[PDB]
């Protein structure tokens, strides 16, 4: 009934005998339009979504391929937008920095011209050649293209860092305490730090069927549940998972809910992504964010603005004393 | 017992070193009751009231060589150059003379600001349209952001017939500026200042809300004056505006500010109808000639303000 469902059951029947050009055909699908009852009334973002859901092969404009020449404990892959200078300045200068070897990248599209996008195309060369972290692929930087820059970045992951131990993906407005990260890393058994996928892991989740929220989906896109799927504003994974992330991705449909996408991915591989208590998706305690030890022990907050991101760090440097 | 009415009223009295007196003015600790308990904002503004004489870190003096009719000076911040490089593109392009200005003073790493500098100075070459102070450029700080403006018109830019200062998040219909610039009477094009005037207004005494003013500090109402995002008068205005400055308290409100500064040269500001500080037919925005007469619309994003410029282009035809 919904297209996608019908759409990834199709991709099931030639990826499993037991049933018996979805990732390189770059030119409009038209069959959206007669076969998706109300196509043409639809926002904006789900027709280009429908019409364009068959290409994934875009290919990086700005690259770091030598941003793994050591073998990585921690990848931290932060995603952003072009314009979000500060944010990533901030990152840079607090819980990004690089260091048990800690690497950092950004994940952006493209913000182009014919979207009437401010021309900052010049700023981000020169910021790419000061700070060499930005990493940029010519697809359009949208919401529904984000399953896109997951599927990119795990890409980039098996070509140019397949060794890197784990990889932490997440925003650029969540402070996340990399210290803890480093040490959460270390109550780790060999065992578990093989398969390794932890967040704010939601279950029982459904589409948002209100046609004025962020996340809605409408009943003729998408019928049924979401899998487990840790969603919110960061997770920390093995590299041995991100590889074998990777190459399920053929069989699961881009889906314009990236991290529901990541979930769709990790249960087709027979896997639950693991909840945990320090990532806080909303926030910290009843605003009393103002002492630094409720900051020791948690792995990410959502959400900060720049100045804040550079303050906590600043502060948690000295945590140990303090408490 | 409102400390800036008692301070105002005494500066009402010298004109019938309140501008460079940048040390902690500590009386304001023992005569402001309840200090120590007001939020930092206001113990900051309330500490170095009297301190006013800051100097040009990035200037542009070249700016106004060719007599210009408008003079556009966009208030900004440093992290935001999506919202600069969206106004040079669109609404704010230069070009009866254009120039551009953005008005920006200081986010210091000691306040624990991203450094930004190497950037800010790349983007000042590259577009010379950057005029940056060293003040640290907070909410508080923003009626020094207007005076040290005005400072700057009369020292590096007297020529200007009129004058838009507007935020860096409004979209402004910069051909139609130019259009009521000509339904002018050569005597209103002297004290033309208009906006969205709002009268009768009074401080809020919310803790919680973002135009706060406890009772400790400012008693009464606020005169007329043009808020929202933007408004426009004249050069000759601006000259004048600027004098008086030296005889009115800075207020941590810089709308309020200027109609303070107004009011007292026995101006009323002129509201206009033009001046959307809340938006548009409530959504029904998707349609250009909305804008076609209207001088400015808050909010915009980057992306929008191009958006609608480009549509405005060909408006003519079509509306
Ligand atoms: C992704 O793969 C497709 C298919 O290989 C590419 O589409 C080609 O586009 C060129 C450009 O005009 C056409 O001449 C070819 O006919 C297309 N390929 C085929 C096999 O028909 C596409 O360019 C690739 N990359 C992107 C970013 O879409
Ligand atoms: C995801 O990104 C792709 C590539 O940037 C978008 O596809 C382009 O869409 C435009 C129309 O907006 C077409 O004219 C181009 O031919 C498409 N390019 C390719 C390579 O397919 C797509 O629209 C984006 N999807 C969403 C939902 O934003
Ligand atoms: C405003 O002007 C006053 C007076 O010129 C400045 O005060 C001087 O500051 C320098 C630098 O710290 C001192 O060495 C002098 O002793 C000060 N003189 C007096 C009389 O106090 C003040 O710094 C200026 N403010 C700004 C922001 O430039
Ligand atoms: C307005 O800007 C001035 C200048 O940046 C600020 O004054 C400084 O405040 C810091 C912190 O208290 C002092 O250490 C400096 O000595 C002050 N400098 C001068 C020249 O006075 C002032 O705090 C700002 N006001 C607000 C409300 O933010
Ligand atoms: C205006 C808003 N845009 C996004 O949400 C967006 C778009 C592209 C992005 N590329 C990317 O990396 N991110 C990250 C999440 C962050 C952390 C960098 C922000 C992106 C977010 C929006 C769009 C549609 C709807 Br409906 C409602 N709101
Ligand atoms: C976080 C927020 N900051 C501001 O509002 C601010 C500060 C300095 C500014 N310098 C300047 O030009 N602007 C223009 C208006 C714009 C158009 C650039 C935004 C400034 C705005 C805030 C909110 C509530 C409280 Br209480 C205190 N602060």
Redesign the interface.
């Known amino acids: 009934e919904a297209y996608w469902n019908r759409e990834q059951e199709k991709l099931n029947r030639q990826y499993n005998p037991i049933l018996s050009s979805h990732l390189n055909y770059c030119e409009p699908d038209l069959r959206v339009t007669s076969v998706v009852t109300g196509f043409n009334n639809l926002p904006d973002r789900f027709k280009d979504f429908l019409l364009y859901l068959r290409c994934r092969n875009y290919s990086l404009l700005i690259d770091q391929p030598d941003k793994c020449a050591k073998k990585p404990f921690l990848l931290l892959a932060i995603k952003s937008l072009?314009?979000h200078?500060?944010r990533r300045?901030?990152i840079?200068?607090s819980w990004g920095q690089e260091s048990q070897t800690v690497v950092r990248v950004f994940l952006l599209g493209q913000t182009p011209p014919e979207?009437?996008?401010?021309?900052?195309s010049?700023?981000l060369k020169?910021?790419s050649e000061?700070h060499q972290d930005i990493l940029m692929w010519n697809y359009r930087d949208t919401f529904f293209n984000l399953s896109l820059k997951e599927v990119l970045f795990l890409r980039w992951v098996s070509t140019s860092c397949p060794d890197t131990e784990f990889v932490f993906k997440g925003d650029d407005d969540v402070f996340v305490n990399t210290h803890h990260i480093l040490n959460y890393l270390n109550s780790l058994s060999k065992t578990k730090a093989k398969d390794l996928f932890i967040g704010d892991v939601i279950h029982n989740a459904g589409p948002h069927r209100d046609k004025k929220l962020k996340y809605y989906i409408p009943e003729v896109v998408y019928s049924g549940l979401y899998p487990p799927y840790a969603g919110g504003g960061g997770f920390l994974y093995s590299g041995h998972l991100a590889l074998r992330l990777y190459h399920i991705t053929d069989q699961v449909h881009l889906y314009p809910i990236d991290d529901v996408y990541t979930g769709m991915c990790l249960q087709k591989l027979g896997l639950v992504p693991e909840k945990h208590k320090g990532f806080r998706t909303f926030d910290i305690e009843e605003k009393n964010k103002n002492n630094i030890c409720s900051y020791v022990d948690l792995m990410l907050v959502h959400s900060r603005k720049?100045?804040?991101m550079?303050?906590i760090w600043?502060q948690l440097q000295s945590a140990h004393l303090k408490c």
């Open positions: 072009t314009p200078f500060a300045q901030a840079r200068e979207d009437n996008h401010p021309d900052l010049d700023m020169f910021e000061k720049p100045q804040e550079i303050d600043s």
